[PDB]
Design a binder for this molecule. Structure first.
Ligand SMILES: Cc1ccccc1CC(C)(C)N
Lengths: 300, 237
């Protein structure tokens, strides 16, 4: 069980850690988060009390290094950094624990939520999507654009999601125009799964990461990517049975966790009504259809 | 984007453009089976592809054999239309290819866009105009060539006959749309107006009678009367 200590909390901020969050008052004696479950990626995210504009945060895995947070008064944000001096880190953390200056990652034993949301989200997949190759952790914020968005403006600060475009030459084989447009199985199975993504685990990783960036940061482009990746599977007549069963579980936990008062901007009415009620897979997402109809029947 | 009354002179500028109307591609008669059920029988159809500036009409005849053994024919018809339009464009020299294709029904946008992905500099647009091109099969010579076809066939016409020698392409298109609206509203009365006088004839190489300028103003007035009336007899006014 690992720890992310903080140097201090100089500005009032709501701090998120995975699906949890807590409020820290300006200059309160806060020195970080302990008992973080090993074996999963995590995200630690920030919303300043004085500027609810820009949520930002860091995806990280405690197995990959010792990481801490330190506020930067010039750039005006809480920065994640790595401590290379392992012995020094251990000593700082022990002392903060002794003085009980850390909040506990508050996981309920029965609770598999975070696993279910990150089953395919590992740091090596996150690093292909997000770039700062000098750090082992990845920064994301609310305004970061996607590669596809920049083709429709700083390249260093972009999300590398695979550009899914149903009316594109890669999506449509010459002479199969109608077949490929009405049935996306070629596009899903051949262009995306066998050639760009390699397997369904990389595909699911990008899909889950896109959802989580949409939910935690309000990232517009990540919201679009999540829906595009669902629609590509649902609009394919031929999808391995094991992918359909896993997708149903994936979406079920995403819908279960989505904040109820954010459902209006995070969920696209057209995509979900098509996927659940018109698409080839309209009958293959039983868990997801049942939770959608009982929690968000207004959308449908 | 969409084409409407506001940008109507654009049709007659010097960017090559084509209208595509798919309303007569898939045509059927509905009839009873021996068992008392209902069945359809397809009849020959056509794609109506028209350059509004020159009058050039590319009439692709759709023979009923193209439907044999196919399902969801109304949907297939839209994709078949798009495949044929694409093929037409690819057959034209580059300097003759359109810069815009305007479809008369919005359901033709995605099929045509997908078939034209190879032509990113050709704009595919809908329109807010209610154009009466469905009535093209009320023109006797066009209907005749469609129904006599025993195989797929492309036939080329100028739908303006020789009018552009005397009037502009704006005026010719207005005259065409008036004639087709009349034929769509009351085919019989419309056709009576056009042939009432036996001394005015249709040249072997034309679709419409050889009216003088004066006779055309009369004809056009009679077509307006028809359209206003039939709308009378329709709304009781
Ligand atoms: C995530 C991943 C892993 C392996 C291969 C490809 C991908 C998807 C990218 C390219 C990042 N959009």
């Amino acid at each position: 069980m690992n720890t992310v200590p903080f140097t201090s909390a100089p500005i009032e901020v709501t701090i998120g850690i995975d699906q949890y969050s807590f409020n820290v008052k300006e200059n309160q004696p806060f020195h970080g988060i302990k008992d973080i479950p090993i074996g999963h990626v995590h995200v630690i995210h920030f919303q300043h009390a004085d500027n609810s504009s820009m949520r930002y945060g860091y995806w990280f895995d405690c197995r990959m290094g010792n990481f801490y947070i330190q506020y930067d008064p010039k750039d005006g944000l809480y920065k994640m950094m790595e401590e290379r001096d392992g012995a020094k880190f251990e000593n700082i953390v022990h002392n903060f624990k002794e003085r009980q200056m850390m909040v506990s990652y508050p996981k309920i034993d029965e609770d598999d939520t975070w696993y279910n949301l990150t089953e395919f989200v590992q740091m090596d997949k996150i690093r292909k999507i997000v770039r700062k190759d000098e750090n082992q952790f990845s920064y994301v914020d609310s305004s970061m654009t996607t590669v596809q968005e920049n083709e429709l403006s700083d390249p260093a600060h972009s999300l590398n999601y695979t550009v899914i475009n149903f009316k594109s030459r890669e999506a449509i084989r010459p002479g199969h125009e109608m077949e490929d447009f009405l049935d996306k199985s070629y596009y899903l199975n051949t262009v995306m799964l066998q050639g760009i993504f390699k397997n369904s685990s990389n595909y699911f990783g990008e899909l889950q990461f896109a959802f989580l960036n949409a939910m935690f940061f309000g990232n517009y482009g990540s919201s679009l990517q999540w829906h595009a990746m669902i629609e590509l599977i649902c609009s394919s007549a031929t999808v391995p049975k094991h992918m359909l069963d896993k997708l149903d579980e994936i979406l079920y936990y995403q819908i279960k966790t989505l904040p109820e008062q954010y459902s209006d901007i995070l969920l696209n009415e057209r995509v979900w009504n098509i996927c659940l009620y018109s698409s080839f897979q309209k009958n293959s997402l039983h868990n997801t259809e049942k939770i959608m109809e009982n929690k968000y029947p207004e959308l449908l | 984007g969409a084409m409407n009354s506001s940008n109507y002179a654009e049709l007659f500028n010097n960017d090559i453009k084509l209208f595509v109307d798919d309303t007569n591609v898939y045509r059927v008669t509905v009839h009873k089976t021996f068992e008392g059920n209902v069945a359809t029988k397809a009849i020959n159809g056509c794609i109506f592809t028209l350059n509004p500036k020159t009058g050039h009409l590319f009439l692709k005849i759709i023979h009923t054999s193209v439907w044999a053994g196919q399902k969801r024919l109304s949907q297939l018809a839209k994709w078949k239309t798009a495949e044929e339009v694409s093929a037409l464009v690819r057959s034209l020299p580059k300097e003759e290819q359109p810069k815009q294709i305007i479809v008369t029904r919005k359901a033709m946008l995605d099929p045509l866009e997908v078939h034209m992905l190879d032509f990113p500099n050709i704009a595919i647009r809908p329109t807010e105009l209610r154009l009466p091109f469905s009535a093209a099969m009320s023109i006797d010579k066009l209907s005749d060539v469609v129904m006599k076809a025993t195989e797929p066939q492309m036939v080329l016409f100028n739908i303006y006959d020789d009018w552009l020698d005397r009037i502009s392409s704006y005026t010719a298109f207005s005259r065409l749309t008036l004639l087709l609206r009349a034929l769509k509203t009351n085919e019989e009365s419309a056709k009576m107006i056009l042939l009432s006088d036996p001394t005015i004839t249709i040249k072997s190489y034309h679709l419409w009678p050889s009216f003088t300028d004066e006779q055309w103003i009369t004809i056009e007035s009679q077509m307006r009367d028809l359209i206003l009336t039939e709308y009378g007899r329709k709304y009781n006014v």
